[PDB]
Amino acid sequence: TQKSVVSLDPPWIRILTGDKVTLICNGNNSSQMNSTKWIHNDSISNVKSSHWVIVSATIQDSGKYICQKQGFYKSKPVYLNVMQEWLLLQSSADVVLDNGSFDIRCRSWKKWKVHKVIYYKDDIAFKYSYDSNNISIRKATFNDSGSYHCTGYLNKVECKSDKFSIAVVKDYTIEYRWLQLIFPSLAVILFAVDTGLWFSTHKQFESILKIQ
């Protein structure tokens, strides 16, 4: 019917090496096989099930994913990012529509516990929690755009995470608006030919003028 929708079912676009992530096509609770076409990094994969389960994410599992359920259209691409750090600020999304919602976290390496977590936005702290859990930001506005990072405590050592930028926009950018500039770019070429043809025609017409 309509387009397909691909959604990870951990809703985190940033994960660490060894994390488990499952990718879901149009959406149901079933691993229906021989019914889905999966494209990763512009190359069709051998997976044909409705669910693409990754038990241990690797650096090579990053990139772009597209699923196409049988009888439907191709889906909007989703990006997965796999990294290795000490502290990583997980986020549910990097671009949020108005009145949207997104979560953040502060996660450490390989099931290590973080304590005394402080969440910063543009170098200004807005929350603190002893444990590392969700920070749900509902009904997003333009005030919720900036650079995010967290500084927690490892086993006993303070560590700092890299800054992540989340932007709230009225509507998504469609990344292909320059394609409509081909038509104006072609008219100037055709119009330039017209001016060149005048000079040749006027010169030839002037040849008869001088003859007379």
Binding site: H115, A125, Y128, Y130
Partner: protein, 316 residues
Amino acid sequence: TKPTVDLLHSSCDPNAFHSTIQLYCFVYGHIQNDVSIHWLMDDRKIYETHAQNVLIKEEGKLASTYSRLNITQQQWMSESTFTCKVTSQGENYWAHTRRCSDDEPRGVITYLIPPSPLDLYENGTPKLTCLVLDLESEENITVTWVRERKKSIGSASQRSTKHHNATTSITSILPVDAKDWIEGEGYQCRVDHPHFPKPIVRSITKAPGKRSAPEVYVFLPPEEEEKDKRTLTCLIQNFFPEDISVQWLQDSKLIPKSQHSTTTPLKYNGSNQRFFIFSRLEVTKALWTQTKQFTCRVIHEALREPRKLERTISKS
């Protein structure tokens, strides 16, 4: 006779795996051949103790023995109360040990600040401060104060503050009596919260040691100095404990604390603890030349009444 029953125990050895902790029940001064030792955990008896009653020494009727109890690590980390029952001369004696509770539940830091010498010996209105830091929120946190001898405590004023790191702090201040502090009264500040497995308990008392009055010397501005500013220094040394108060005066008029500095005390050569500090006050040439005198008075608990010692410095 009253034997001195004390309970000692071992603990983790970082250089070994150490999957066992040993309990000892020393009895000192008891009547010889009149001692019996029994062990109970959580007020319930244990029979398979496998104790080793070994005598230590004998002094006439008086004698000393001890027992050894071998418990596992998990039996100790469970915070169960282990008690030793001593049967001497028909009487019963007790001694309890537990694994001490965590002092920072949920990462909450608590400080108990003693009264300042200026309030204790000059103003006469001392106060104890209990600072609770790193709080997720102020709600449901209660603070209680306990004395040692009397059940009558004063009213404690409590305030909350949210800092720049999005953390809340609570400051409870209890006015105390200078005399009771002088005799050596003890005070506690018990912080409680439903999510705390155990309450936070902090105690404070007057600092123990051997007191010694300080010696203070004042130096004129350096003769090599003839610039815009003039510097006056105060040297206080040979005092114990670390609690001292220093304030500057100008023609018998107090100077704000932001117009002078003081250094952190440093220990001096031991083994008996001694400290020294330097106090510096820098004034301009025009102020210094206005034909007056300056003063450097200190307040300490080792000085004779009224516990004040002052030294005046002037060009005349």
